[PDB]
Structure formats: C-alpha cells, structure tokens
Amino acid sequence: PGSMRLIIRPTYEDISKWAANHVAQKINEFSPTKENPFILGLPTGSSPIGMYKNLIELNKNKKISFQNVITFNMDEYIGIEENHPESYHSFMWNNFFSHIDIKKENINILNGNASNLKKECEEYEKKIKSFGGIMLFVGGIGPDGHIAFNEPGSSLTSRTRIKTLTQDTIIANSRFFEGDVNKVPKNALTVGIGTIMDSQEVLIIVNGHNKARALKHAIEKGVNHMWTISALQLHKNAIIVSDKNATYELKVGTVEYFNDIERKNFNNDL
Amino acid sequence: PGSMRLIIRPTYEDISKWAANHVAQKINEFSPTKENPFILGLPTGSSPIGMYKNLIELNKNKKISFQNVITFNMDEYIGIEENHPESYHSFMWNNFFSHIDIKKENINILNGNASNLKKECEEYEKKIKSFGGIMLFVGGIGPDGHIAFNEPGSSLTSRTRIKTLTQDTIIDVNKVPKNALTVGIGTIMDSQEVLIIVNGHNKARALKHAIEKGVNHMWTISALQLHKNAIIVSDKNATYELKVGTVEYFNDIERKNFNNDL
Amino acid sequence: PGSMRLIIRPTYEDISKWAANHVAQKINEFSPTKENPFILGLPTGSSPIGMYKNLIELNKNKKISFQNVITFNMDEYIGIEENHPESYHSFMWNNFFSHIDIKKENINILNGNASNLKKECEEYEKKIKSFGGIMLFVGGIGPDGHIAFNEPGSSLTSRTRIKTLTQDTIIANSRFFEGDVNKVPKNALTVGIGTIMDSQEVLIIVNGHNKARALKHAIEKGVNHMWTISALQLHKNAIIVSDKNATYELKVGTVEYFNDIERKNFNNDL
Amino acid sequence: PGSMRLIIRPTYEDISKWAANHVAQKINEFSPTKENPFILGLPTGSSPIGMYKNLIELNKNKKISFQNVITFNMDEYIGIEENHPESYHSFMWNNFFSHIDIKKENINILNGNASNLKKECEEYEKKIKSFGGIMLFVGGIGPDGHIAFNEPGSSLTSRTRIKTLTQDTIIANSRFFEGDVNKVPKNALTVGIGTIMDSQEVLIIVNGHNKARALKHAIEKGVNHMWTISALQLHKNAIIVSDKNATYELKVGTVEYFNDIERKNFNNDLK
Amino acid sequence: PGSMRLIIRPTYEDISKWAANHVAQKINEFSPTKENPFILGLPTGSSPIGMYKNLIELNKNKKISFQNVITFNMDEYIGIEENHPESYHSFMWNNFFSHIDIKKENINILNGNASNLKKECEEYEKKIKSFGGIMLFVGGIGPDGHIAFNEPGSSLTSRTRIKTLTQDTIIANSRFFEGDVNKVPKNALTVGIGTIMDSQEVLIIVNGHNKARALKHAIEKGVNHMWTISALQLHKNAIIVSDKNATYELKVGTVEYFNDIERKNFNNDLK
Amino acid sequence: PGSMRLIIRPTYEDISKWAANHVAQKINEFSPTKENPFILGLPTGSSPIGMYKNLIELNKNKKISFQNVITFNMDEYIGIEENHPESYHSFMWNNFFSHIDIKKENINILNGNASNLKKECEEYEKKIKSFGGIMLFVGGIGPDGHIAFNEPGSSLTSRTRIKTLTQDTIIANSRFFNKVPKNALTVGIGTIMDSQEVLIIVNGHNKARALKHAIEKGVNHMWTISALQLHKNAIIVSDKNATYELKVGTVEYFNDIERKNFNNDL
C-alpha cells in the first residue's frame, strides 16, 4: 500500500488464519526450489500456535509445501537437553515440524548446548546471511513489548547473542517448569532486534488486552528501547496483525486510519 | 552551525523569500556548469508557491540561473494524462518551469503512465544516483506531519514506490486517480541537504512532533532528526505549539551562526 | 547480560571508582601491545574528574599501564592557543595525561588552530578508523542531555564537525573565562553522535540531581535529537553509571529492573 | 448507571434527535405545572440547532409541551441590539422560541444592555436560585474545550460575569456576523462554570473531527482550566452525546467502556 | 506533618500491620463512649483482610475495643440474600464483625434488598450525618484506580447511589460466583467519592504490582475521573499505605520525598 | 476579563514594579479608612523583595499610605524568638514594615510560640474572617510549585496548620543559618484561596517547569500552585525566563487577553 500495515480482526482465531494465509501466499508467490529456497524465521510461545495449526492444514490440502523452506528460530535456552519437553527444539517439533513436509536439514535452531556459545551465535548470523537473509520473519510480543528474549533495554540494533533472563521473564516462563523459578534455565541464545530487522519482511501477531499498552507503544509512540517492538517503525516492510482486544489503547483515529488503508488497498485497481 | 536549524519569520511571505534566497544562495555558491550541474529536489502543493514566485522574480532580475540545474519532483499520479491540468507535471510547468531559464531535458518528474511502474520507480532512484545524489531537496509537510505521499506509518527509510491514496487524500471523488508514484523518506534523506517550509496554525502540531518529540513513524517529518543537514523554515503561526524555550533556543542559534566569524 | 546496563551507586565517588575500574578492566583484559594498542575515547568537564583521579592512583600502584593506550578526545575550541590554561589540550594534560605513563604521540586531540578545519575533522575521523575504531568511549552528559558539543538538535548520526556554541554553553563555560561570555571562544571542533556510536563500547557517567531529567530522557523516553544522549538506545554495547541523585526522575520499576539485571549477571554461571 | 455517560452515534443528525428525545423525556417525566415548572438551561451556537429543530417537531406532534418550562440561556453579547438577528436573543427566538408553545414571561436571557452589568449577572444567579436551580442544562463545546463564553483560563468555579472576548472567539464567532471580525461585540455576559455545575443534570452535545481533541481532554485527561469542559468530571450527573467523528482522539478502550455502560444501563433489570 | 502521607513498607504483611495499628491508635486516642462513639468506614475485597486479622488480634488482647464504634460499609450487591456466602454482609461478619466486641446495632451496611433503592441510599447518607460524619474511612483501590463500586467515570463528587456494574467489574468478581459472569449481580449500592471524602480522615491500603499504574495516577497525575482515587488529592487528611511492589510506577524522587516526610514526622518533637 | 490573567514582562525588576503598582492600584481604588480598612495577605522569600522595595518607594513618594492596611503573613517558624534575625517576624520588619507608614497593631503574623499551636491556627483563621476576608493575597512559588510551606502533596484545600519541614528546606535554609526549627505554622492553600483576589510573582528559569504545571497542566497536588485554576480571581505575573516551558500559543493567548483588557471600552 506504501506504509507499515496494521490488520485488525475480531479474534485470536481470525488473526491466526490471516497470518497462516499470509505466510502461505508469500512462499507460494516466491515458489521456492532446491536452488532458491524460501527463508523463514519463526517464533515460539502461545501466539503462533493458531497460525501453526492453520499452516499444517493448508499443507495437508496441498495448498503449500515446506520442502524448500529453510527455517530459523528466534531463540533457545542454554543448557537444556534438546529432548526436554520445554526446550524450544521440542516446542517447534511437536507444534509444527512433525506435521509438515519440511526437510530436517532445512530446520535451524540455536544450539544452547554448544561448547562456545559466542561462536554458535556468530555462526547463526553467518548461516542466515549465507542464504541471503530471512525473507519473512514471524514474531509475537510480550506485554512489555519484548520480542524473543530481546527484553526492555535491548539495543535497537542488537544481534544474536547470549541473554541472561531478567526476573519478569523467569517468573512468566516459570509456569512451564512446574511453577519453580529455580528450574527455568538462567540464560538463552537469542537473535537480536537487528537480526529480525534484517529480514525483508516482518509479521507480528498480537492478541488480548494484556498486550494493548505494548501495541500502543509499538504504533503510536516514538522509537524506544524500553518497548523493543517499536524498532519496527524503522523497517521497510512490517505488518502487525492484531485482534480487537489488543487495540484497546490505540486511538479510535489510528484504528480507522489503518482500517481505511486495508479497504483502499483492496479497491486500488493494482 | 553543526545542528538542525529552525528559521522563524513573521509571515508566509517572509519564509517564502527566505527559502527562495536560500535555494538561490546554494546554487550560486556552487556555480553549476553543464559538466557539474546543481541537483535540486522540489515539492508541490501550496506551501512552496510563495518560494516559486520569488524564485521566478529573482530569475527575471538575473540573480540566479537554472540553465545547469537538474530538478527531481517527489511524485505523480498514476494513469492521469501528463498534460491534464491536475497532474503534477502540469503543476510544475504552470507554476514554475514555464517562467524560468530551465532546460526541458534537465527536468525529472515520475512517469505515472510508464508500462512498468516498478521499473519506473527503480530507474528514478538510479537516475538520482547517476548524478551522485540530490544536493538540496526542498519539502513541505501536511498537518499530520506527512511529506507528500509519505504518510503516517510510512517507513522512516522507504524508497520510491507505488502508493495507494487514503480516502482522506481522495476527498467528484471517483475522478481522482487511485494511485501515485512517490519518492520515499529514505530517497529524500539521501539528499546532502533538506529544507522544509512550514506555514500556518494547522501545521503547528506537526511542527511540534518534528522538533520536540521523538522519532515516530506517525509523524514522517520526525525522520529529519536523523539527517546530517536539515533546515526548517517556519512562520510564527506554525510555532504556536512549540515551547517558548525551543523558539529562543533556535533563534539564538541563528544569531550565533550569523556572528560565528566564518 | 545482552542489554544496556545502568549501574547505580550511592555517590559521585562510587561511580568514579566504578568507572575507573571498568576502564582498567577492559584495558587489562585486552592486554595491549605496540602492534595491538587499546583505543580509548575520553571526555572533559567535571564528570570524569573522579574517574581520572582513580585511574591515576591505579597507574601509580601499577595496576594498569597507559604505555600502549591510544586516546582520542571529544573536542577542542577553535582559535585557542594550545597552551592556554582553558583549552582542552591543557585540561587533559593537567587533569590526566601529565600523571600517567602515556606516550605523548599516542594522544589525539582535535586541533582547533588548523588552517582547514573541515579537513582536520575528516582526518580525525580517518585517524580513528586507521586504528580500527575506538574500543571504549567514555562520556558524560549535560543537564539538557548533550554530550560534548552535540547540543540539542544535533543530528542523531552527526560526524566530527565545526560547531558554533549556543548561549547556554557560552554562559556555562563563562565561569572558566572569568565570568565573561565574550572571552569564550565562539566555535569548537567536536566528534559527532555517530562518531561516538561507532565505538565498540560506550560508557556514560551521570551524577547529581540536575542531570535527573536528562537521565530519564536517556533511558525511558523515545529516541529524540533534543536529548542527544538518547541516541545510545541504538548502540550495541552501552553502559550508564549513575549516582542515586541522578535517578530521581526514573521510575522505581526502572531502577529495580536494571539492578536486577546486574544481580542476574553476577549469578548466571558464565 | 451512577457514572458519567457518553452516548456515541454515527452523525450530527443522530445525536440531535437523541438530545431532543432526552430533553423531551426529562420534561415529560417531570410533568410540570404553573406551580411546579421545569427549569431548563439552553445554549446558542450551531451545536444545538439540530436538537432545536427536533424539539419543534416533537412540539408540533404533541409529544412535549413548553407551557410550563422556564428557560435560562447561557449568554448574550454586551451592547448588541436585542432585535438584531446576530444577538442571542434573536438566535433563540428565530431557531427555537418562535416555534414552540413557550410563554414569553418564562424565557430568561442575560440583558447585555443593562445599566449595571455586574448587578445583571448577580440578578441572573438569584433568579436561577429563586426557582430552585436549573434541572437540565444543555451545552456545547468549542474546539478548545470552551463552554458558553467560559474560554480557556476561566476559573473552574466561575460564576455569571462580564467576559472580555479573546481574538480566537471573535474569529470563530465572526462566522455569525457575516465573516466580519470587527462586527463581533467585544464583550459578553455569561454564566460561569460553577453556574453550570449547579444544575441537577448537564447534557453536552459534541460533533465533528474539529472537536475530537476537546473530547479527549474532556473525558480522558485531568481537570484543567485550559479545557473548561473538563470541569464536568466534578458534576454529579453529566451526559455527553457525541457523533463518531468527535471520538477520533479517544482510546478505543474509552469508547468500548462507555458503550458497555449504555448496554449494561439498559439491561440492568431496574426501574 | 501537614501533607498527604505515603507509607511504604516491604510487604502486604507490613502494611496490614501498619494499617491495623493506625486504626487502633485513632480509636484509642479519641477514646469513644456510648454518648460519643467513633465513626469508622470500612471496605471489603482482599486488600483489608490483613488489617482485619490484625485488628481481631489487637481486640482479643484488649489493645482496642469496638464496643462504642459505629461502622459504615462501602457497598453491597443489589438482590443478593444477606446469608449468601458472597454477599458483603457475610464477607464482613465472616472476616471481621463475628470476631470482635462490636455491638450489632452499631453496624451499618447498605441494604441491597430494600424496596426503594433510592431512599435506602438517601437514608444511608442521612445516617452518616446523624453521627456528625465518618471519622476515619478505610479503603483500597482496584487496578483501574476505582474505589468501592466508584468505577472510572464516576463523578469526583458522587454520593451514595445505585451503580450498574460494568464488564470489567463483573469479570473480576466472577471468580467469587462460579467463574460465571451471569451469576454476578448486575447492580450494587455504593457510597460515593464525595461520601468517602466527607470523612475527617481517609486511609488507603494499596499492594501489588497490578496496582502500580493506579497508585501513580493517584499520587503523581492530575485529578481525573478515570482514576477516581485521585480525588483524595483534594482531601485534607489522607494517608496511603503501600507495599514496595505497588510503588513500581512512581518516580524514585516521589518515593524518596514521602519517605523523608515520615522520618522528619517521626523526629519532629511533637505528639 | 473574567479569566485568569498572565502578565509577562522582560525582567525581575519589571515584574516587581508591575506587582507593586497593582497592589497600590487595588488599595487606592478601595480607598481605605480606619472603619473600612484594606485587608492584605503577604509573602516572604526572595520573590517579593523587588515588590517590597518598589512599594517602599511609592510610599515615600506619597502615592499610597499603609495607615489603614491590615496585613496577614503566610507563616512563621515554631520555637524561634521573634527577635531572631532569621524569624519571619524579622524578615517582614526589616524588609518592609520598618520603612512604611503601617500601624503596628494592623500587622498579623502567626505566633509560633503560642502555648496551644492548634488554637493559634484556628484563631488566625477566625481573625481573617473577622475582618471579612483577605481582599488581595500576594504570593510567590518555588521551583517545585510550592507556595511557602504548602508543598508537594499538600491538600489542594489545606487550611492554617502545623507543618513539619522536609530535609530540602532544612538544607536550603541552612545557609541562612541542625539548629533550624523543625516545624512551622502556615496558612493553607484553602486559606489563600479564600481571598477575593490572588497575585503570584514568578521569576527565573528555575521556575519555568512550575509555571507550566500551574497553567497548562491539570490540577495536581504535586504542584500546589495549580490549585489557582479553581480560584475565581487569580493573576500571575512572570518574567520572560519563567515562561520558557510554556507553549508559544499560551504566551500569545494571555498576551492577547492583556491587550483586549486594555482596549475593552468598559
């Protein structure tokens, strides 16, 4: 249309469908091959689950193939067995990779057990750039505007790196490790805001009242390292899909403005 | 001076004369030849009308020549007849290019009738570079802080592209063209120097976001905080939402700049 | 830890010590030689005085050597005699360089008496790059958020350049030219914001109630050319060290957030 | 429902009708007599014209009578001829009082031609109190949050007083004096913010994008003398009716919150 | 010390103890009699439970007596049976009144099953006034700054009245009614903001991160009807007791400022 | 004009002169006699010194007489000798009362050595009312918006009362001196706002942020001066430096009110 895009739909399910379709459409138009595959960045968390389910379905109905899609994931804990049910390796396999025609060797996830964690990070960044860069990175946001383990105060140009988890993250993630703060791994490897920003296109899925304040900071306020999602304002091709509830802190006029862009870009004759 | 400059003058006429003189000063100082021409970016709309009248008047009175000035315009509607009175081509010729010693071939305006619109955008960006960049781009802003078709939410580093008009810009209504070609915020930012003319009470809130508030994609003009050499010239009405201290601060810079012994 | 760090200590003496120890720590671990020297950016003003005093003592107790350290300063006045007691050449020699085992040909300060000032600036930028860039730039901020002569409205990507001084700077600096505003040199040469941002690591020292507002704009408010320190939000490796008094306009939760990062860092097992 | 209400509708026509019906309802439920009349405060300006037209039709169609309604207007200019079309006296007669079954002696308007203007104001306040206060005051707001001639900087507790008009108000109101800025009277008599707040109930009509910023400062921002409308936060029984356009600066959540109050209020199983 | 006070302690347990002690100290110093009773206003919700526990202990230990204490509670649901486990009548008996030496006839709770609900509210305000006003009113606040059922948009000078509950109140209280929003009574009677602020003294208990935004809007931001607690800024004798977690949105300087007020208050050579 | 006024003049000396003439103007227009005296409330601190010097000059030039002016001051320290050079009594005497034809018995200052301090505050309130109220109260503000001892967090409707000083006031007033009096008696914001009219003098860059909160921001107990938004008849007089945090449009708005108030034909 000519600007950052905000797509507002009523429910979590509707945004999940819009997103899955959008990912399918980008890959299908690209038409990957063994020689020129599609490079896809993916999130974990509750946010992308509906999208994952919809993509599995489209794949079953042969509306999309992952044979020539190469994936990079955002992050993984340091010092967790790949087979631990709460590892992000397991999250991805059980929620997505097991159910689609993806090639095991096309899957890239940070190795939180590497001997040299600093090199593992540098190598991930090299691998991404060896493929020409991520074509589409899909992500989600936290209530404080974080993406991945890029927590408030993360540099707006940060790269893949070691991350010690702050108290808020250990608390929030503690529910996956039997309510026990002592059982959440202390550290993680994570792509940076800069890494994500290097993508040719960025899609963010946001839902619920608890992300409303953050969506306000992403959209309407100035670029600010306390709300690292605000970095997206600098990206050339970014899209945020939000449910109605995550818009409660936006101004009426902002919603109308982005609603009209979608209507006008529908009837544009191009 | 080594910082942004905000030039405040009592009226629309004062800022028109000031901006005309600045363009005229920049071009004379550089002394353009057929071999080394001056590369100038230009706006449309009502804001620069005054400037254009003054520039015409200085061209009659032999204070400047446009013989070796290459110009680039920001935009054009897609599908409109080039010679349609409402086209950007027509705006430029009728209000400026018809009254000055400019050469037809040194004029660059986007062709919204190109067979491939994307390539037209690509070539336009390639053309600017083939001259080694705009030297001075002059612009205006909307009350929502937009610069031409780079509207709120435009990427604070976008390039020349097809832009679909928002219903607000559309308002007959079904006669207006649905799409435009436009340079990007990044295209403008590439310029060696950027001058923005702002006038009137309705631009005051935009000016405040441009100057005092943080870099924000809802106010396109705020991308200028990141440019190395930006000047804003504003009349008094457009300053009504600035702090007294901001005004005194930028006024002092002007006096100290005037008296720096350089 | 993988974010901006804010180190808060009770007094100006504590941060002075903290900063000296940090500088010493980075030089000692790099272990510079004649072929591989450490590149150090430095500030003037009263901010770093305590740090300089501590670095001097550490040098006397042989806990650090400046023999293979190359320094670049932020600024100098245009048209002041090098040996004038108020020049920044004199500031640096008298408060610091006179007192450490630094080699004189390793010291770089902008020459405000150079025939072609625009070229002096270009050359200073070229000299920094000839060494491969500044490895640690230490800076201080003004009550209005300025660093060095990058005053409000300095471009957030500014380079080394001629700068005309504003009244507030002339008035403030007039104390050192016997309270006469007219004895203050009118222009200076200064490194830009981008120049400081090019450094691998930036450390900012902040003290006192009259910097509280500026620290707030630096840490909590969006990137903004009126508060040029806010540009550090975009830096990959920035640390701010502050006394308690300069934190008064931050939120309680902000201080606790950055205090927790520090404690986690210490307890991450890395 | 025991809170402020904000009633949002698509257009100026919708809110005008809604406001007319609300007024009709309060009057009909009160059921006034000569001994016990209904006391109604009214504004001028363009905001209430729709409401006035609707109130005339309701009157013609026997759904409301004004026989026992006593009115007090907000303001009148000083030194304008009572019978000149540009006066608030004439505005009220031409747009409203001429077309309804009101009794002439029950109409109250500030006398901008009184010998002692200060005493005129004091008498106005006493006359309001003499009837037991205003039961419903209808007002509008300006783009800067002003009500009547209570311009930004007016005391949040102001009473009826002499008011010297600012250039901004003269420019705006010149639309009512053939665009001639020098035809606008320099001074006005006006009820105060306090006077308005003494009303049992207040109804405010707001429309258009150019009032959006004012509505935000009325609803979402703190009590502030630069936005005199914000004073209603202190009123016991305030209603604002707004078209959609005037809501553009409110948070989505604010609209959703007041919409839900209307929904809950109607479905609350009470009388 | 002549200003609002903000007492910051580490935990909920500390503030509960501080609040209980402060109530006992006020009642003991007044030293009430049958002829001259202490008039005490009280909240429900989880906030005051700590305080209630402490007061019961103090009472058993004869460190405070409720024999000549008249109480008024904030609110009660409409159309709930007094015996219902989740009524406020029961909350108060079960968590407080059953365990102390209070006289049953000295206990005043709004009657949500009254035939004329308006008269009930009116009679509640009259009764408060018949005793010369509330001497100390204790309250808490919600995450949106509400107090009692004085939800956002409630008038800053509101009195006792029927309140239709909004979506977020219904959702938050659904946890006490089988997690089913359709079981939560739709309406309540509630004292107003004006009713609370009529008290000689107001003591507010705040705890937890989820109250941090509201406390900031209470302490630092302008008087604003969307954060009804901010009205305390106009009260002459207001105290807030907060745990450390509820202070996360306040400025470092605000916390230091009120902490210093407490040290200087303690060390002032007056009592 | 029927709104608050903001009078802006270039310098401290200009606003002191403006404030002095405004006080002489209100007094002279009232034309006080012993039977109907003029009731005046007054400030201390550095702010009004200029105004006090100008009113002394006006008094010697026979342009005003204080014979039938009853004054009330805002505060006084608890447990200081009135004769102490740093007491509020001594400040007023030495900076104003000694130099003008005021009657000694027409002068009111809180007695910080009263045996019952609370009764002293109540009695001060009663005395103000006994005269039928203050007709004009002159005040100043601090950088944090405080009005004398009515400091951040004071009730926007506070009355005369005992006030315990903060560390900042004990520190800032240790130059004028641990031997600082820890408490003071002070009139309240509510007390000041009972006046028929209030004039506030604001000077210097360090009060610019306070002036912004007074005028453009909502009523807020952290900025005591904002309470004036509720007063029926408030005037602020300010030099240019203290307007630095106001919007251009606010300055031009109030300047136009000052122009229209001159040219109104009333």
Swiss-Prot record, chain F:
Q: Where is this site: Part of the allosteric site?
A: 154, 161, 163-164, 253
Q: Name the EC number(s).
A: 3.5.99.6
User: Mind telling me which PROSITE patterns this protein's record contains?
Assistant: GLC_GALNAC_ISOMERASE
Domain of life of the native organism: Bacteria
Catalytic activities: alpha-D-glucosamine 6-phosphate + H2O = beta-D-fructose 6-phosphate + NH4(+)
The family database entries (Pfam families) matched by this protein are listed as:
Glucosamine_iso (PF01182)
- The answer on whether this UniProt entry bears the keyword Hydrolase reads yes
InterPro entries assigned: Glc/Gal-6P_isomerase, Glucosamine6P_isomerase, Glucosamine6P_isomerase_CS, NagB/RpiA_transferase-like
Molecular function (GO) terms for this protein are: glucosamine-6-phosphate deaminase activity; identical protein binding
GO process terms (BP): carbohydrate metabolic process; glucosamine catabolic process; N-acetylglucosamine catabolic process; N-acetylneuraminate catabolic process
**Which pathway or pathways does this protein act in?**
Amino-sugar metabolism; N-acetylneuraminate degradation; D-fructose 6-phosphate from N-acetylneuraminate: step 5/5
A GO cellular component entry from the record: cytosol
- Kindly state which keywords UniProt assigns to this record, in alphabetical order: Allosteric enzyme, Carbohydrate metabolism, Hydrolase
How does its record describe regulation of its activity? Allosterically activated by N-acetylglucosamine 6-phosphate (GlcNAc6P).
The secretion signal range is none
Active site feature: 75, 144, 146, 151
Q: Which NCBIfam families match?
A: nagB
Family indicated by similarity: Belongs to the glucosamine/galactosamine-6-phosphate isomerase family. NagB subfamily.
The task this protein performs is described as:
Catalyzes the reversible isomerization-deamination of glucosamine 6-phosphate (GlcN6P) to form fructose 6-phosphate (Fru6P) and ammonium ion.
What is the official name of this protein in its record?
Glucosamine-6-phosphate deaminase
Organism in which the protein naturally occurs: Borreliella burgdorferi (strain ATCC 35210 / DSM 4680 / CIP 102532 / B31)
Question: What is the organism lineage in this UniProt record?
Answer: Bacteria, Pseudomonadati, Spirochaetota, Spirochaetia, Spirochaetales
